[PDB]
Design a protein around this ligand. Structure first.
Ligand SMILES: *Cc1ccc(-n2ccnc2-c2cccc(C)c2)cc1Br
Ligand SMILES: *Cc1ccc(-n2ccnc2-c2cccc(C)c2)cc1Br
Lengths: 8, 230, 230, 8
C-alpha cells in the first residue's frame, strides 16, 4: 500500500 | 463509560504516560474517556486522540493484511478465514468507535477551521480503513462517506488555511492515498499531490524555521508518493 | 475457558497465525486454550506457548519500567503511581496465569527431561518477573520460588541433557540473570555463565551444523553478559 | 537490565 501520513 | 469516574485532566495526563509506555490501547481508552467528558479538545489533545487510535488501528490493519494474504494464498480448513474475520470485526469496531466520537459530538461543536478540518480528516481516514476491508454491500457507501468527509475538509482548508498548514498538507496526502488505493483514481491522486506540493513550495518563504521544518517534512512525503506512483 | 469450544488443533493453528500477524495477546489466549485441553504439549507447542507469553509480559515489563522511572523522577498528583499500579496488576495477572498453567497441570505431567526442564525454566522466569515488581512482603518468598524452580531445572538438565542443549543453555543464561539482577549475587551469576560457556564449548565437536548454530548463538549471549558484567 | 534469553 502507498504510505499515508505517519504519526507527528 | 468506564472512564466516567476519572477527571478529564487525569485522563489526558494518563494518555501522555501511556504514549511514553507504548501502551496505545490504554492511550485510546483514556482519550475516549476524555472526549466523553463533552468538552472540546485542544490542539494537543486532538493530536493525542489521533496518535492513540492510529496506533491501535495500525496494528489491526497490519494483522489483517498478513492474514488476508495467507487466506488468499490458501485459495485447508476454516481457521485462517475465521481468524481474519475476527481481526476484521475488531478493526471495524475500533473504526466505529472513532467515527462515533466524531459524530457524538466532536465535529458538530468544531467551529474553528483547524479543529473542524482535523476531525473531518479523521472521519475520512476511518471510513478509508473500513473501505480497505469492505466487500460487496455498503462498500460503495463507505467509500463515498470517506470521500465526502475528505472533500468537506479540503473545501474548508482551501478557504481558511495557508497551503503550508500541516493539517492541510496531511489531509491532502491522505486524500491522495484514498484516490490511489481505494477509489481507483490514480490520476486524481497524482494531481492532488502535485498541486498540493507546488502550492506549499510557493508559500514556504512566509514560514519560521520551525514551521518550515514541519511543512517540508510533509511535502517530502507527498514527493515520495509521487515518486512511487510515477 | 473462552476457547473451550475450539478444537485443540485449530487453537494451535491460530496461535501460529497470530504469531505471523504479531498478535501476541491472541497468540497467548489460543495457547492457554490449547493447554486447557489437558493434553501434554509437543516441543513445537511448548515453544509457541513460550513465545506468546514472553511477548505479552515483555510489553508489560517495558511499560512498567517506563512508568516506574517517571514515578521515581517525580519523587504532582496520583496519576503516575495509579497507572504504574494498573500496569503492575495486569503484569502480575499474566504471570499468575502462566504459573497457573504450569501448576495445573503441565509440570506434574512432564516426565521427559526436555519438557520438565522447559516448564521449570518458565516457572523460574515468571516468578522472576513477579520479583521485578515485588516490594516488602512476599518478595522474599517470590524470589525463593524463582530460585527453587531454576535450581530443580538445573539439577535435571545437568543429569539428563548435554551441555550444549539449547534449553539447558537458555536456562543457565536466565538463571544467571536472576542471580545478577534479582538475588544481588553477581559473582554467582558470573560463575554460572562462565562454567556454562566453557562446558558447552568443550561439547561443540559432537554437534551437527544446525545444532552448532543454535548452541553457539546462545553461547554468544552468555559471553555478551559476561562482557557487560566484567 | 542485563539481557535475558530472546525469542528463538
Ligand atoms: C493529519 C495530521 C497532519 C498534521 C499533523 N501535525 C500537527 C502538528 N504537526 C503535525 C505534523 C508535522 C509534520 C509531520 C507530521 C506527520 C505531522 C497531525 C496530523 Br494527525
Ligand atoms: C528457554 C529456551 C531455550 C532455548 C530455546 N530453543 C529451543 C530451540 N531452539 C532454541 C533457541 C536456539 C537459539 C536461540 C534461542 C533464543 C533459542 C527455547 C527456549 Br523458550
Amino acid at each position: 500500500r502507498t504510505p499515508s501520513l505517519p504519526t507527528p | 463509560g468506564a472512564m466516567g469516574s476519572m477527571e478529564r485532566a487525569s485522563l489526558i495526563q494518563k494518555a501522555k504516560l501511556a504514549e511514553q509506555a507504548e501502551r496505545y490501547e490504554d492511550m485510546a481508552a483514556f482519550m475516549k474517556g476524555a472526549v466523553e467528558k463533552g468538552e472540546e479538545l485542544s490542539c494537543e489533545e486532538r493530536n493525542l486522540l489521533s496518535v492513540a487510535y492510529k496506533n491501535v488501528v495500525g496494528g489491526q490493519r497490519a494483522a489483517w493484511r498478513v492474514l488476508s494474504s495467507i487466506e488468499q494464498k490458501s485459495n485447508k480448513g476454516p481457521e485462517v478465514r475465521e481468524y481474519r474475520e475476527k481481526v476484521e470485526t475488531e478493526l471495524q469496531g475500533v473504526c466505529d468507535t472513532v467515527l462515533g466520537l466524531l459524530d457524538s459530538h466532536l465535529i458538530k461543536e468544531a467551529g474553528d477551521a483547524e479543529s473542524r478540518v482535523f476531525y473531518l480528516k479523521m472521519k475520512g481516514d476511518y471510513y478509508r480503513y473500513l473501505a480497505e476491508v469492505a466487500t460487496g454491500d455498503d462498500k460503495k457507501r463507505i467509500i463515498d462517506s470517506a470521500r465526502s468527509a475528505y472533500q468537506e475538509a479540503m473545501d474548508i482548508s482551501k478557504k481558511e488555511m495557508p497551503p503550508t498548514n500541516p493539517i492541510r498538507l496531511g489531509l491532502a496526502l491522505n486524500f491522495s492515498v484514498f484516490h490511489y488505493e481505494i477509489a481507483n483514481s490514480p490520476e486524481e491522486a497524482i494531481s492532488l499531490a502535485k498541486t498540493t506540493f507546488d502550492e506549499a513550495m510557493a508559500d514556504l518563504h512566509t514560514l519560521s524555521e520551525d514551521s518550515y521544518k514541519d511543512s517540508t517534512l510533509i511535502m517530502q512525503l507527498l514527493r515520495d508518493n509521487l515518486t512511487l506512483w510515477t
